[PDB]
Structure 1
Amino acid sequence: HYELPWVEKYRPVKLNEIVGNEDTVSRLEVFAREGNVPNIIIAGPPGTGKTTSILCLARALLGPALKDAMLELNASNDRGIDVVRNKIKMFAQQKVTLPKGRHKIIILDEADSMTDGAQQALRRTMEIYSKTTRFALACNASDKIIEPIQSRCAVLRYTKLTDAQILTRLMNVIEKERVPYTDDGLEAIIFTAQGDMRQALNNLQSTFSGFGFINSENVFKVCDEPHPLLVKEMIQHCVNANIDEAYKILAHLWHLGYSPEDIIGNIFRVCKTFQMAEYLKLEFIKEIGYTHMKIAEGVNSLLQMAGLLARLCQKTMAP
């Protein structure tokens, strides 16, 4: 036997063990206890617990009938236009003896990967057989799922987990695993997680396996500080036309091994939601795109990124 990693070993099996989004998880607990669950589409960031919530709800609704009253499909399966007609519809037509308030559950994990034709064919087989079967879809990008499918389901949206919500589950894992720790170490794990429970468990397991103790320097010897936390500071320095501090942050990101594409992607990501003037934001975005065309065409050096920073600082002083 091989020991599973703590992401898969400490996956919650009950809906009460899921932290974060307390209203939606509490309503899912009520629906698992009583029954008659509507069609559900859960959207949100990765690592939030959408697949865990869907699987726990399906398991608590069915019980012993899970192998015969559930159809789970992923992006690893085909699920093309010939599978919605011939497998999903045949499972919705299938007779399964179930208790009252319980229905067959068609789990469609990662529904963004489905084509538009498959989602168009899914509409009437979801609407007709709703007396016997139910749908539980999970997704990251809610815009990929079309408007009729979102109208045919209850669109639950998960937000990023707070630091206390991650800290509660991490303390549960620590007390289960007897991991020695300090407060600054768990603060560093929460900082490197960035709303992701998978990354929190992976970083905790990596630090505990590599060093055996959780302090800040043991975490940061293996984990890394996030990129946009410094990209926001360099964009703020470019707003105040301070080229020296912006180049200091740019050279710090360059010596850490980040490619120009990743750096300019984080620069565009920060400048998209930065708090400044709108016309200045549009000029910044146009200069970022002009630099990114040069980055993609082949020329990608520190001089090009420094020239981009100089052009962003020039856009401030030229109204």
Structure 2
Amino acid sequence: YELPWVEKYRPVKLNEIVGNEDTVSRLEVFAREGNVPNIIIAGPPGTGKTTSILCLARALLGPALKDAMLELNASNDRGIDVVRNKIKMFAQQKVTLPKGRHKIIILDEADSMTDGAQQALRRTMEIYSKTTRFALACNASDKIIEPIQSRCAVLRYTKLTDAQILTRLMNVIEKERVPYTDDGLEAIIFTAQGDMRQALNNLQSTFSGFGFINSENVFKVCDEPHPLLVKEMIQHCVNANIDEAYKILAHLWHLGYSPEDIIGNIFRVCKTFQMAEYLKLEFIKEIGYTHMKIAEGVNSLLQMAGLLARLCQKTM
């Protein structure tokens, strides 16, 4: 048994996080200076939020991490009776730390916490600021109520760009001696959708299945409506060619892809397609309306054909 590459190459220092440079440098500044304030960590999944918070806490606390840090996940109980009984009791606890160190409470995935739990969190954070600090983490920052963001230095994480994912993929490939081709790298990056965890998982899955990393193997392992088929269908919609676009769509339907998957890939490809920007925005709005219909439950081949027709008539 070997650790998965998502955990095998998990960063253990803030220096080896390829995420947002400004926030990473800010976290390193907090680790060096010492007097870190309460911080909120929002961003897309798989960008390094939890890794950054745990690395920061580890660097700050050293050996005192085991008894000075309280890490709570989505799998833990974090109700109103925890922010008031567990969080408060840990905050009141006496830990001897160096001069600029504090007890770090990591409410990881705090967006899952209710409004009442965070209201209980509010001045439990405020009072014990002399002795303990709170490091939140979430995907959506609007899920954290106003006072917590008011009393926290809201750090923002953003999707890893294509180049960052490519550099980390090169590092992992070199350290694992994995055969590859540039087309396979582009396929892995496309299927990653800006998540380093997803990129690593896809690369490891393709290595496990087929060893070699090329686009064919990547899309065999990471099965989704092929970006080339979806791209040429979008191109047919730009040329107002309903028949060819429906040929592609019906081929995708016969392959068994759900309309949700098809429309997701349609949006992904159309987002970075070669169009006049006004026409691209028109296509995005039409795809959004069709996706709203699909999510509402009206998910049939006729809906996708109607989307294709509306895209075709957007160009007249």
TM-score for the superposition, normalised by structure 2: 0.85
> How many Å separate the matches in 2 of 1:164 and 1:294?
35
> How many Å separate the matches in 1 of 2:179 and 2:271?
41
SS of the residue corresponding to residue 66 of structure 1 reads helix
* Structure 2: gaps (5+ residues): none
> How many Å separate the matches in 2 of 1:278 and 1:163?
21
| Deviation for aligned residue 1:113 | 0.6
CA contact (8 A) 1:188 1:219 kept: yes
Which residue pairs with 1:180 in the alignment? 179
- Classify 1:171/1:235 alpha carbon distance in 2 versus 1 (closer, same or farther; 3 Å): closer
| Deviation for aligned residue 1:226 | 6.6
> How many Å separate the matches in 2 of 1:273 and 1:218?
23
CA contact (8 A) 1:239 1:316 kept: yes
Q: Deviations over 1:114-138 (max 9, x none)?
A: 0011111111111111111111111
SS of the residue corresponding to residue 100 of structure 2 reads coil
> Which piece of structure 1 moves more, 116-125 or 239-248?
239-248
| Deviation for aligned residue 1:67 | 0.9
CA contact (8 A) 1:48 1:159 kept: yes
- Classify 1:182/1:266 alpha carbon distance in 2 versus 1 (closer, same or farther; 3 Å): closer
> How many Å separate the matches in 2 of 1:290 and 1:172?
41
CA contact (8 A) 1:192 1:226 kept: no
- Classify 1:117/1:280 alpha carbon distance in 2 versus 1 (closer, same or farther; 3 Å): farther
| Deviation for aligned residue 1:279 | 12
CA contact (8 A) 2:219 2:226 kept: no
> Which piece of structure 1 moves more, 64-73 or 216-225?
216-225
SS of the residue corresponding to residue 238 of structure 1 reads helix
* Structure 1: gaps (5+ residues): none
> How many Å separate the matches in 2 of 1:154 and 1:254?
47
| Deviation for aligned residue 1:315 | 6.6
Q: Deviations over 1:9-53 (max 9, x none)?
A: 211111111112112112211211221011111111111111100
| Deviation for aligned residue 1:164 | 1.8
- Classify 1:232/1:37 alpha carbon distance in 2 versus 1 (closer, same or farther; 3 Å): farther
> How many Å separate the matches in 2 of 1:112 and 1:170?
30
> How many Å separate the matches in 2 of 1:58 and 1:146?
24
> Which piece of structure 1 moves more, 192-201 or 241-250?
241-250
Which residue pairs with 1:51 in the alignment? 50
> How many Å separate the matches in 1 of 2:292 and 2:185?
41
CA contact (8 A) 2:225 2:265 kept: no
Aligned length: 316
- Classify 1:278/1:37 alpha carbon distance in 2 versus 1 (closer, same or farther; 3 Å): same
> How many Å separate the matches in 1 of 2:18 and 2:225?
23
- Classify 1:75/1:297 alpha carbon distance in 2 versus 1 (closer, same or farther; 3 Å): closer
- Classify 1:106/1:246 alpha carbon distance in 2 versus 1 (closer, same or farther; 3 Å): same
> Which piece of structure 1 moves more, 166-175 or 6-15?
166-175
> Which piece of structure 1 moves more, 67-76 or 203-212?
203-212
- Classify 1:229/1:116 alpha carbon distance in 2 versus 1 (closer, same or farther; 3 Å): farther
SS of the residue corresponding to residue 106 of structure 1 reads strand
CA contact (8 A) 2:225 2:252 kept: no
> How many Å separate the matches in 1 of 2:140 and 2:226?
22
TM-score for the superposition, normalised by structure 1: 0.84
- Classify 1:21/1:101 alpha carbon distance in 2 versus 1 (closer, same or farther; 3 Å): same
- Classify 1:45/1:231 alpha carbon distance in 2 versus 1 (closer, same or farther; 3 Å): farther
Q: Deviations over 1:275-317 (max 9, x none)?
A: 9999999998998798779867877442343234335545765
SS of the residue corresponding to residue 265 of structure 2 reads helix
CA contact (8 A) 1:192 1:224 kept: no
Q: Deviations over 1:135-175 (max 9, x none)?
A: 11111111111111111111111111112211222222222
SS of the residue corresponding to residue 168 of structure 2 reads helix
- Classify 1:213/1:305 alpha carbon distance in 2 versus 1 (closer, same or farther; 3 Å): closer
> How many Å separate the matches in 1 of 2:289 and 2:19?
41
| Deviation for aligned residue 1:92 | 1.0
